[PDB]
Structure formats: structure tokens, C-alpha cells
Design an enzyme around this catalytic site. Structure first.
Site, PDB file in Angstrom:
ATOM      1  N   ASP A  81      47.177  70.904  53.108  1.00 37.67           N
ATOM      2  CA  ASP A  81      45.769  71.949  54.007  1.00 37.67           C
ATOM      3  C   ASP A  81      44.833  72.019  52.739  1.00 37.67           C
ATOM      4  O   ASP A  81      45.563  73.277  52.268  1.00 37.67           O
ATOM      5  CB  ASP A  81      46.876  73.274  54.202  1.00 37.67           C
ATOM      6  CG  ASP A  81      46.638  74.480  55.075  1.00 37.67           C
ATOM      7  OD1 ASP A  81      45.248  74.497  55.029  1.00 37.67           O
ATOM      8  OD2 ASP A  81      46.201  75.139  54.081  1.00 37.67           O
TER       9      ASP A  81
ATOM     10  N   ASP B 254      55.896  99.813  30.669  1.00 36.62           N
ATOM     11  CA  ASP B 254      55.737  98.892  29.573  1.00 36.62           C
ATOM     12  C   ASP B 254      56.250  97.559  29.831  1.00 36.62           C
ATOM     13  O   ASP B 254      55.831  96.362  28.963  1.00 36.62           O
ATOM     14  CB  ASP B 254      56.909  99.809  28.156  1.00 36.62           C
ATOM     15  CG  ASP B 254      55.767 100.904  28.093  1.00 36.62           C
ATOM     16  OD1 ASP B 254      54.384 101.185  28.520  1.00 36.62           O
ATOM     17  OD2 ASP B 254      56.216 101.790  27.061  1.00 36.62           O
TER      18      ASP B 254
ATOM     19  N   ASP C 244      61.891  90.501  48.046  1.00 34.03           N
ATOM     20  CA  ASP C 244      61.062  91.019  47.792  1.00 34.03           C
ATOM     21  C   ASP C 244      59.797  90.293  46.858  1.00 34.03           C
ATOM     22  O   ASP C 244      58.880  89.692  47.368  1.00 34.03           O
ATOM     23  CB  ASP C 244      59.969  92.150  48.438  1.00 34.03           C
ATOM     24  CG  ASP C 244      60.741  92.681  49.626  1.00 34.03           C
ATOM     25  OD1 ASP C 244      61.396  92.432  50.308  1.00 34.03           O
ATOM     26  OD2 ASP C 244      60.233  93.352  50.438  1.00 34.03           O
TER      27      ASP C 244
ATOM     28  N   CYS D 196      59.890 108.658  30.278  1.00 34.36           N
ATOM     29  CA  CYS D 196      59.692 108.363  31.136  1.00 34.36           C
ATOM     30  C   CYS D 196      59.346 107.245  31.747  1.00 34.36           C
ATOM     31  O   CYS D 196      57.799 106.865  31.079  1.00 34.36           O
ATOM     32  CB  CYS D 196      59.645 109.662  32.766  1.00 34.36           C
ATOM     33  SG  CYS D 196      60.824 110.890  32.386  1.00 34.36           S
TER      34      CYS D 196
ATOM     35  N   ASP E 113      41.823  72.531  53.502  1.00 35.02           N
ATOM     36  CA  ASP E 113      40.783  73.282  54.404  1.00 35.02           C
ATOM     37  C   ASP E 113      41.540  75.172  54.480  1.00 35.02           C
ATOM     38  O   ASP E 113      40.040  75.898  54.999  1.00 35.02           O
ATOM     39  CB  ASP E 113      40.245  72.992  55.968  1.00 35.02           C
ATOM     40  CG  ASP E 113      41.239  73.236  56.859  1.00 35.02           C
ATOM     41  OD1 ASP E 113      41.856  73.875  56.688  1.00 35.02           O
ATOM     42  OD2 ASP E 113      40.834  71.907  57.566  1.00 35.02           O
TER      43      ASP E 113
ATOM     44  N   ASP F 139      61.729  82.197  41.034  1.00 33.62           N
ATOM     45  CA  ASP F 139      62.739  82.134  42.481  1.00 33.62           C
ATOM     46  C   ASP F 139      63.505  81.334  41.456  1.00 33.62           C
ATOM     47  O   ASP F 139      63.869  80.445  41.694  1.00 33.62           O
ATOM     48  CB  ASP F 139      63.245  82.496  43.857  1.00 33.62           C
ATOM     49  CG  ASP F 139      64.892  83.104  43.908  1.00 33.62           C
ATOM     50  OD1 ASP F 139      64.814  84.522  42.983  1.00 33.62           O
ATOM     51  OD2 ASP F 139      65.123  82.453  44.787  1.00 33.62           O
TER      52      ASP F 139
ATOM     53  N   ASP G 110      46.729 102.535  28.397  1.00 32.17           N
ATOM     54  CA  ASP G 110      46.883 103.754  29.468  1.00 32.17           C
ATOM     55  C   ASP G 110      47.465 105.075  29.028  1.00 32.17           C
ATOM     56  O   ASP G 110      47.673 105.894  29.650  1.00 32.17           O
ATOM     57  CB  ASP G 110      47.710 103.199  30.358  1.00 32.17           C
ATOM     58  CG  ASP G 110      49.306 103.141  29.700  1.00 32.17           C
ATOM     59  OD1 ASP G 110      49.570 103.221  28.025  1.00 32.17           O
ATOM     60  OD2 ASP G 110      50.285 102.539  30.224  1.00 32.17           O
TER      61      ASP G 110
ATOM     62  N   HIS H 208      48.505 101.474  23.741  1.00 33.45           N
ATOM     63  CA  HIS H 208      48.463 101.193  25.061  1.00 33.45           C
ATOM     64  C   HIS H 208      47.177 101.925  25.403  1.00 33.45           C
ATOM     65  O   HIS H 208      46.895 103.049  25.686  1.00 33.45           O
ATOM     66  CB  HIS H 208      49.774 101.497  25.453  1.00 33.45           C
ATOM     67  CG  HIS H 208      50.509 100.805  25.050  1.00 33.45           C
ATOM     68  ND1 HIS H 208      52.553 101.582  25.873  1.00 33.45           N
ATOM     69  CD2 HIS H 208      50.622  99.649  24.329  1.00 33.45           C
ATOM     70  CE1 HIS H 208      53.097 100.926  24.731  1.00 33.45           C
ATOM     71  NE2 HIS H 208      52.645  99.845  24.697  1.00 33.45           N
TER      72      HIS H 208
ATOM     73  N   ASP I 285      65.857  77.666  52.136  1.00 37.27           N
ATOM     74  CA  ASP I 285      65.696  77.865  50.443  1.00 37.27           C
ATOM     75  C   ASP I 285      63.957  76.986  50.341  1.00 37.27           C
ATOM     76  O   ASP I 285      63.186  77.867  49.548  1.00 37.27           O
ATOM     77  CB  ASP I 285      66.704  76.919  49.311  1.00 37.27           C
TER      78      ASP I 285
ATOM     79  N   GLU J 258      46.102  69.776  57.632  1.00 37.70           N
ATOM     80  CA  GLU J 258      44.816  68.197  58.884  1.00 37.70           C
ATOM     81  C   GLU J 258      45.386  66.997  58.548  1.00 37.70           C
ATOM     82  O   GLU J 258      45.642  66.736  57.486  1.00 37.70           O
ATOM     83  CB  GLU J 258      43.832  69.652  58.590  1.00 37.70           C
ATOM     84  CG  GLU J 258      43.100  68.721  57.716  1.00 37.70           C
ATOM     85  CD  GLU J 258      42.976  69.718  56.093  1.00 37.70           C
ATOM     86  OE1 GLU J 258      44.204  70.933  56.495  1.00 37.70           O
ATOM     87  OE2 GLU J 258      42.416  70.196  55.376  1.00 37.70           O
TER      88      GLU J 258
HETATM   89 CA   LIG Z   1      44.370  73.384  57.212  1.00 36.13          CA
END
Ligand SMILES: [Ca+2]
Ligand SMILES: [Ca+2]
Lengths: 643, 643
Positions: A121, A335, A369, A622, A123, A154, A448, A446, A161, A129
Site C-alpha cells: 500500500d 523520569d 494497548d 511522586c 498510496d 511487543d 521539566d 531536567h 499475531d 493496490e
Molecule cells: Ca492503497
């Protein structure tokens, strides 16, 4: 594509013809020495032109036409449809002597025409395609083409799979079998062998088992030809992200090979190539919609948990609570974990980078996820030292995914720097065009600790929030002038009480004033780089009061909690509770911060992460991190500068 | 560029101001806590705006205007001219209390404005322009910009020794001295430290001596500031060509650094950057005008020398004669030396790559005109295995410098390949976009055994010449049919006589016919790749008769000298003498080749390099190479595909 085929003396040369090519054919070499002229015949689905010195004429299936034999007189042979079992596709040349009209010999070409195409694929719509003419190249931008691969994050096979991998389909058309002496082989370079892997079902009659056919130590695979119209489905994975020595591009080839003889290499007759780009890792700035909030803390920091829960309950976000681990720092979710994503046309998901303090023993926590990538050093190596800006335009140049910001030291300083491996990784992703800031004036080092970004509610715009010592001193001097000099800080932190820190005590500490003037110079140096590289003006910046103490290395640690490192959930901000001087029974730091932010429609909730420790020495125990929705803008539509 | 400067309590902050920037200035932090409003004064050459929440108003040098003190009310300070000794450039802010009009304090800024610019020839005309706005970037093409560096190919200093290097000029303007606490430093990255070197005269009062100030182990150099309008001249060299890990781009920086205190890094106040691209090595195809012809051979090959001299005398070229060396093969001028060039806007010259068989003990021979680059293995590593095409256009894509051609084996064959180091070098030059051919069917394995290019006289066009066994067999069969089968080859080579090789003997050798059919398949495979990758049709190709014998590895060596490897001097071709069958007292191979080439206006001279050896076993003992004028097209005007 033109291919050279020469007729053989007194014989019918046999050849496979691949659709999409044509053959230029020498008839002269096959002629008897005593021959003068030639004629030809051909079957219905073979198109034949006689080409004399560049000028071509179409020839009928059975004509009587004769031509003089010359090296410069050749045939051009074309076929537009694949052979079937019913086909007899051929061209035959008859040779004649001086007094002609009865042939003295003949030579011919028996043809088997097949279609062979390796399809992807290109495009970028999610479907494969048929034979995209651009599939062998990869171009950036809205009009760009070429196929995209995801790194397998993973880490006999089941099709389930392989569900997230990219599809590649070998499409063929032809008769029951190829002629003797031909095989089809799929292959990759040695160089690409650690970048990619390819799976398919070698034996479909015996089951659905998908086996790894290309990758480490496997550079080629012979694929069986089946007749009629056939498709072979392959699944393709990336093994690694772009890096210093790897652009992200990989190629896969198929060739039709012809057996010549024993101990001679097979001749590639036809080769088809597809290119993939491996999708980069992309960081999510604070302006993107929050999905889930992850926090870590000791089990008994009750106020932190209660107040974070209350904050998240004002939103539609989910809260995930994590505790401390032996192999990790107290801030590890901030961190040691960086939240980002990868995307291809067919799929995308969030991908976390993990760099555990002591190494691995969290993937269980984050859940299925997420893709999860773990590293194989100074405090600047922390992901607390990595931020990413909202989308910006800088002198006409657009950064639709924002720019990654990395804390560093000055070039000639001999100071600390994030490791080259990580810097090179971030640079290689290309789409976030990283910028180095100056964090090495801080003990921890850092970015932050001094800056963040927040969206402006009801708009597409955003603010840069900067720590400011000048803002703190101005506020405290104002409160002192107002008669509040004896106002005490750190109320309720019993381990601070004996210090009796007041506004007066802070303002009269001469050395501390000088240290903080210097830290403000450090902050301002960053302010200037950020305005330059993000295209910001002063109207885009809000300064939050901050104060630091200096160590023996002349580096800064927070005097009271750094409010700039805050949880940003759209309009709702979880802000570290500062424990500032109380004026009329309210913290003057909290009141000042509300006065800056609330008029813009931001809603401030102060979160106490330090009371459980009874004091504050500059260290926070924390951490938080937020999984956000990816950008709507597709990374492959960017046009990054060339390197 | 905007820079942040904050006023200091009760003081005049002192700052250097660099032209091309401006200052946004906080007046609020410096105010007494009890202050309400402020007013300001400034000198004539300092422009001051009061900016309240984004809206700016110009302020007079001495007005009485007052403004409310606010964090959101700041100054914008600009200067358009550098300070002199006569300057007192300043801005002063007065602060007032509740009942106002007499100032209760004041804070000020004393300014020294200077110009600092690191300048290079980015617009590529040979002169160093003042502050090219594009000097920090490098772009390809006709409209492209950024400076070009040559590799130093010859390898306290004299200016004359630096004459070929690139100029870089630090231009400054200001008063007699900078204020206390500032220095100017030129610097490079560690990464670039082996790519570049920089020279200048550190002590001009004591002489002209140029010293190396930046390069290996030297990453920075402090440069002395001189007042008035000053220029410091630096010379810059490249140390190496682009390669696998090096794009060719290098950067040089200058910063103005501010001293803060002991044991604290200096703050870069201003930084200016220039980029250079190191010019690639470019190979010269046979269509370019010849300058000098280099030959090597044993001292006693008299016919070769005499005939080459005669050939060159027909041209305006110079002849350079070289003999054999202990550390080199008999063909070394062809095999071990590759002629190419480098070019920048200010200069260019020819550059030879040298890869001696046994290593170095030729630079003396080539002379001072050439740059000389020596390497730090199979026969495919020879420069006889490297060719370059004339400029071509392929499916709309232009290759204005031609394409480099490298002999290889098939991908799955397990055969020989030129070493990765050399392949990666050629690829990295980018401007000749290399193509791999198939040479591994030849014992020696060089593309120059089977192909060459020649210009077509009176035109801008060219021909590809291909060895053809089919052409040889057709010619010999024709001569046999004509009654010439007993015609003998190798006439005059006494060491061949006992073999009695005739046309009949060749044609009746069955195994040899089969071997040469196979070699013709190898030739045709190359023919097809060349037509595809160079955009050629059959009208662009001439086939020269050739014949090979097969070895135990099934690889080819020449049966009679390969005529395709010829000396090309415009219309004049030195062609190896084939020693073919004599018909009517002329070599039928020579006559056939003349009949192919002469109608196109090419003039053929056959050069006998083998008679001195009395026989021919497939090996040639002489070599030639030609120094040619560079392309008129400037390589920096190309737009190579991105990687
Ligand atoms: Ca395509
Ligand atoms: Ca110039």
C-alpha cells in the site's frame, strides 16, 4: 522495460515473458551463413514489429513478407495478456537463400507470458493496490507515496499475531506451470536483515501456520508458483526505529531466476522492488487530548492520591495508580517512561519508551494497548529532561508535530549532556526536529524543572510557562512592603518549623538573592532560545514564581515545589502545592498563580505531594505522566528538511 | 533576534549589544517595592519603545512621560550603529513613589554596541560577501546557497601554502575595547574535528605565520578583539570526502561569551554560524576534452610506445610515459589510478585516487597539478572496474555529470563484489548516482573488459560500445562461407604459431561456441541494465566483435585482445590490435570495426600492445588513462535525490 532475447540456431528458444516488458529480438545471429532474407509468423496474442534502423512496422500473424537479413534489422515482441493452458504463444522466423521462397531453416521463440507484481500500500490508504508505479520509491508530503511499516513493539506464528503488521502481496497470473528452469525468489539485503522480518504460510494445504521467511540469517526465500490468477500474502514487520546509521528505509525484492547450468549462478530475468519506511516514534505535547493519567508515589501519600483522584474526576480521563519498585526511582513514571505513538495507514498505537534506573526486573501495568520499547549516564538522560512543544511555525517553516526539547549544557562548558545514543535516536525520527536547551544549571538537570506548555481554553493557541525567580522576589517584596514580612512559609510541614522561614528571612539573605539573580540569567537564556526556535513572542509566555538554592557545583535545586511541572488536562491544571507564605490565611503563591492563569479560563487545583514527608529539601517523591490522543496530522504528510 | 536583559537594582547594568538583535528589557524587577510609576531617558543612538501588553510606543531622548509600573510593561531597545570612543550609549529609568515627580531611585543600562559577523562565500562567486542571510544553511541547485570547501589533497604555515583553501572572515565593528568580562571564541564540534581545519595569523605584529587553530584536538580558539572596523582572515580546509557516515557538511561557530564568576561556565551572549559543504570527487567520462594521456608498459614494448605516440601526435594532447614498478601491476595506470576532479567557486583541480597493488613506496610523476588521494580484496576492486557515463536523462530525471558504473555479481550469487568501503565512498559523492553492472562473469571482473563510451563527432551525442561474441561468430561464419575458413589468426605472434588457429578451427570448437553463447547472455544482461539506467535505445549502441575462453570457475578471459577498451581522444580512437584472421592481407576484425565506426566520423588507429610478448593468453601488459577537462556544469547546481 526492454529486454534482449536472441534466437538460437535451428531451434525454438523458449522464454518466459513478463507482462510490462517487451523483447527486442535478434533474428540475424540464428540465420544460416548462406541465408539472405527472412519472413515470420506469430500467434494471435503475440505482437511483432520488424524494426529496421529504428523504424518499426507491425507484422501480421501469417503474411508472406520478406526482409533482408541484417544485424540492424530486429524484432520487437510484445504481449498484453498472460498465457493460459489454451495458449500457444509463439513467433517463428523462416530463413531463405539466394533464390528464395522455400525456407532453408527456421528459428523460433515459444513464449509463456506471466504477470508478476510485488504489491504494497504505497498510496497510504490501508489497502494493497495493484502495482503502484511509485512503489519502489518513498516520498514525503501530501502528494507523497510509498508504503509504511510499524516496528514490532511487543518483544510458528498465528495470523492473529500478525494482525498489526503490513501486508505485501505477490500477485501472479499465468498457466499451470512455468517452463523448466525458472524459480521465483523473494529477498532482502544483508544490511536490511536486522531491520525487517517477513512471514507467510509456506504450506497452506497442511494448515495456516505462518513462518518467518526473511530476516536475520534468512536473506532469500523461494516461493512456489501456482497457476491461474494467484495471490501470496506476506506480513512485514519493522525491527527497529530510525537511528544514526539507519534512515528508516528498507527494500524487498522478488526476482524470476533462470537456471543456466550446474555451478553457474541463476540469471535474474525480471526483478520487482517495493520500499517501506519504518514509522518514527512521535512524542505527544500537553495540548493533545488526555486519555489516561498515570501516577506513582508511596502507598501512604494519601493527600497526593486523594487530590489527584479529585482532579481526574473533573475530567473524562482514567486514572492509573502505580507504586514504587526496587529497580526504579521515586519519579519513575515521569523520569523512566516516555509516552509517544507510532502510526501507519492501517494501524497505530501508543508506544512507551522505558529506561529503568537499575534495569528491568510495568508492561504488565500499562496493558496490551501499548507498544513497549526498552533501552539496552547522568541525570540529564531522564525523560524528565525531554519535552515536546505544540505545533509551531518558525519564520515560515511549519513543524506540524511540534519540536522535541532536550536539556543540555553550553557547547564549550564541559558540562553534562544527554547521551549521544538518545540524542541521535530523537534526531533520527526527523519529524519533531529537536532543539537543545540549557538545563545543566540545575542539580537534577531536567527541562521539566523550569518550563511547560498549556493550551489556552476555547482557542487553538497555547502558552509557554516559565519558572521565574524575578517574579517570586517581586511578589515577596510587595508583601513585605504591605506589612507581611513575618509571614511564614512551609506551614504544616513540621520538619521545616524550626527553620522559621519567613518573607523577611528570605529577602535578607544576600547570598540567596545573588544565586537567584544568576538562575534568572539561566532561565532567560532558555527563554530566548525558545522564542527563537518555537517562534514565540512575549505574549505567548507566562512567568510563574519560583525560587532555588545553590549547591557546591553552583547548580540549582527548588527552594519550594516547582509549580511549573504540572499535570495538564485541557483546562484543568494539577499544580504542585508551593507551601508559600500565608497572607490572610491563603498562600500568596497560590493566589498569585490563580491570578495569572484563571483569567485565561484555566482551572487550577493545587496538589500536595510533600506533606507526607514533613519537609521539603528540593526533591519530589511522586511522578505523573499522561497518555494523549495522537495528532490528527499524519506524520507522512510532513516534508522534513533534508540531511 | 530578541534577547532578554533585566535592569539591576539601583545600578547601571552594563551590556554589550550585538547589531542585528534587539533587547527586551524588564524595568519592573529593579523598581523599589514602594514605587508606583517610571520615566526614562536615553541617548541619541539608542532607540527605546515602551511596550505595554504587546503595544509599543516610541520614546524621546528626554521626555517627561510617566508610565505605571507593571510586569507587563517593558522596554524594547534597539541600536542601528556600532559604538565608538565618542559614544555614550545608555538608557536610564527613574522610579517614583505615590506622590511623584521626584525620582526615588534609578536603574540604567550602559550599552556598547558592536557588529560581529562570521562571513563566507555562500552565494558561490569566489568573494566573501557581508553576512549572507543564508550562510547557516546549505542548499542544492541553481538558486541554492552556502559555502564550499575543498579537501586538502596534498598530504607554522605560509600564506602561499593556504592559497587553495576557503576564506572565512570575522568582521567586527566597535570601540577600542569590549567591556570587562567578554571574549570572542571560534569553535567546532568534536564530531567535525577530523573533518576540517582552520588557520590564521595569531600574532600579526611578529610576522605572517599562519597557525592551525581548529581541528583535531583543538575545538575552540579565543580570538583577540580589535577596535574600529576590523577583519580577521581565516583559511579553512576539508580533511576528507563525504563517506558512509559523513554527509559532507561541517559547521563553524563564533560566540561572544560573558564571564559570570569563577567556576561557572561563560554565557554565550551571541552566536553566529556558517556551514560548508565539502566538494565531492567527480569522475570524468570519455566525452570530456582530453588534456594528457598517461601510459604504462615495459620499456621494450616499442610498437606500443611508437603507436601511442603517433596517435597522440594527431591530437593536441600531451603524452606522459610511465614504466613498471615493483609495488604495482602491469596495468597500474589504468587499474590502480582513477582520474577525477574537485571544484569550488574559487578553485578546482584534478584529483587522482591511488590504490597501489602492494601499497605505496607516482605523485612525483603526475606532478604538482594534481591532488592525490591514497587508500589506507578481489580483482573487482580495481579502477578498471569503474567507469562513468556521459550526462544522461532517464525518465525525466537528469544526471548532468553522468552516472558511475561499477561491476558486481548477482545479489543471490555469492559472487565477488567491490569492497563496501569503495562502493560507499562512490555513493556518498552523490552527484554521480552509481549503478552496479555484472562483471563477475569475467575472470578479471572489470567493466572495462566489455564496455566503453565514445562521443559522436560533430554532435553533443555519444555511443555505448559493447563487446559482442555474436558479432564475432557472425563475421567468422560469413568469412568461412566466402571460402576463408583457413584464414589464420595471430599472424606474427610466434608463440601462437604451433596452435594453427584458423576460422575453421574456431567455428568447429563446439564447447567454445557454447561458452560464448553463455557470455553473450552475460553481455545482454548488462546491455539491458545500461539501457534502463542510462536511458539508451538500440540506436545508441554499437557492438564490437569479441571472443572469450572459459576457465574452471566458468568465467571469461579474452581469446583475442578486447577492442572495446580503447583510448578515446575525441574523434581519434586508439584501439587494441586484435590479430584477427587475415583476408586479402587485412585483419577482418580491423576491417569490420572500421566499417562500424568510420562512417560516424571516428578515426581508428590500431595499437599493438602484445607483439612484444610473442603470444596472447588473455592478459594485457600495458595500460592507459586520460586526464580530461572537468564538466562545464557546476556540481553544486545539481539537485540530487534525498537519502
Ligand atoms: Ca492503497
Ligand atoms: Ca560571494
Amino acid at each position: 522495460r526492454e529486454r534482449t532475447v536472441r534466437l538460437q540456431y535451428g531451434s525454438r528458444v523458449e522464454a518466459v515473458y513478463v507482462l510490462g516488458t517487451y523483447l527486442w529480438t535478434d533474428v540475424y545471429s540464428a540465420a544460416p551463413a548462406g541465408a539472405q532474407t527472412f519472413s515470420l509468423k506469430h500467434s494471435e496474442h503475440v505482437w511483432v514489429e520488424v524494426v529496421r534502423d529504428g523504424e518499426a512496422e507491425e507484422v501480421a500473424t501469417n503474411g508472406k513478407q520478406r526482409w533482408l537479413l541484417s544485424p540492424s534489422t530486429t524484432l520487437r515482441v510484445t504481449m498484453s495478456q498472460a498465457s493460459t493452458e489454451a495458449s500457444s504463444d509463439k513467433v517463428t522466423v523462416n530463413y531463405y537463400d539466394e533464390e528464395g521462397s522455400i525456407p532453408i531453416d527456421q528459428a523460433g521463440l515459444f513464449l509463456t507470458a506471466i504477470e508478476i507484481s510485488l504489491d504494497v500500500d504505497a498510496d497510504r490508504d490501508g489497502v494493497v493496490e495493484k502495482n503502484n508505479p511509485k512503489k519502489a520509491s518513498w516520498t514525503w508530503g501530501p502528494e507523497g507515496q510509498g508504503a509504511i511499516l510499524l516496528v514490532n513493539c511487543d518483544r510458528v506464528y498465528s495470523k492473529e499475531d500478525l494482525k498489526d503488521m503490513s501486508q505485501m502481496i505477490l500477485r501472479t497470473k499465468g498457466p499451470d506451470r512455468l517452463p523448466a528452469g525458472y524459480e521465483i525468489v523473494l529477498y532482502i539485503s544483508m544490511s536490511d536483515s536486522d531491520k525487517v522480518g517477513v512471514f507467510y504460510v509456506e504450506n497452506p494445504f497442511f494448515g495456516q501456520r505462518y513462518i518467518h521467511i526473511l530476516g536475520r540469517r534468512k536473506l532469500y526465500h523461494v516461493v512456489k508458483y501456482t497457476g491461474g490468477s494467484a495471490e501470496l500474502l506476506f506480513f512485514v514487520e519493522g525491527l527497529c526505529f530510525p537511528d544514526e546509521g539507519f534512515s528508516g528505509l528498507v527494500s524487498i525484492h522478488v526476482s524470476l531466476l533462470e537456471y543456466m547450468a550446474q555451478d553457474i549462478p541463476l540469471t535474474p530475468i525480471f526483478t520487482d522492488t517495493v520500499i517501506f519506511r519504518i514509522a518514527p516514534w512521535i512524542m505527544t505535547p500537553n495540548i493533545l487530548p488526555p486519555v489516561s493519567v498515570f501516577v506513582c508515589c508511596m502507598k501512604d501519600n494519601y493527600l497526593f492520591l486523594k487530590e489527584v483522584k479529585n482532579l481526574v474526576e473533573k475530567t473524562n480521563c482514567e486514572l492509573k495508580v502505580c507504586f514504587q519498585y526496587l529497580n526504579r526511582g521515586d519519579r519513575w513514571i515521569q523520569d523512566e517512561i516516555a509516552f509517544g505513538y507510532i502510526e501507519a495507514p492501517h494501524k497505530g498505537f501508543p508506544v512507551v519508551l522505558d529506561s529503568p534506573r537499575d534495569g528491568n526486573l510495568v508492561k504488565e501495568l500499562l496493558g496490551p494497548d501499548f507498544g513497549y520499547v526498552t533501552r539496552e549516564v547522568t541525570s540529564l538522560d531522564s525523560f524528565g529532561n525531554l519535552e515536546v512543544s505544540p505545533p509551531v511555525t518558525v519564520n515560515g517553516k511549519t513543524y506540524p508535530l511540534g519540536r522535541i526539547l532536550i536539556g543540555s549544557s553550553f557547547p564549550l562548558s564541559g558540562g553534562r549532556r544527554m547521551t549521544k545514543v538518545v540524542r541521535d535516536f530523537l534526531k533520527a525520527q526527523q519529524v519533531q526536529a529537536p532543539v537543545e536547551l540549557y538545563s545543566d544549571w540545575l542539580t537534577v538537570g531536567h527541562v521539566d524543572e523550569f518550563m511547560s506548555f498549556v493550551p489556552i481554553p476555547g482557542t487553538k493557541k497555547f502558552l509557554l510557562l516559565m519558572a521565574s525567580t524575578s517574579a517570586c522576589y517581586k511578589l515577596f517584596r510587595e508583601k513585605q512592603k504591605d506589612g507581611h514580612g513575618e509571614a511564614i512559609m512551609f506551614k504544616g510541614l513540621g520538619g521545616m518549623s524550626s527553620k522559621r522561614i519567613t518573607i523577611n528571612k528570605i529577602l535578607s539573605n544576600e547570598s540567596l538573592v545573588q544565586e537567584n539573580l544568576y538562575f534568572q540569567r539561566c532561565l532567560d537564556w532558555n527563554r530566548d532560545i525558545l522564542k527563537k526556535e518555537l517562534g514565540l513572542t512575549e505574549q505567548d509566555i507566562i512567568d510563574l514564581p519560583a525560587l532555588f538554592k545553590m549547591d557546591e557545583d553552583h547548580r540549582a535545586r527548588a527552594f519550594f515545589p516547582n509549580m511549573v511541572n504540572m499535570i495538564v488536562l485541557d483546562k484543568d491544571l494539577g499544580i504542585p502545592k508551593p507551601f508559600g507564605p500565608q497572607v490572610e490565611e491563603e498562600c500568596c503563591l497560590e493566589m498569585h498563580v490563580r491570578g495569572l492563569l484563571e483569567p485565561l479560563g484555566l482551572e487550577c487545583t493545587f496538589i500536595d505531594d510533600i506533606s507526607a514527608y514533613h519537609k521539603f529539601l528540593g526533591e519530589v517523591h511522586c511522578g505523573t505522566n499522561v497518555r494523549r490522543k495522537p495528532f490528527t496530522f499524519k506524520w507522512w504528510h510532513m516534508v522534513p528538511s533534508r540531511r
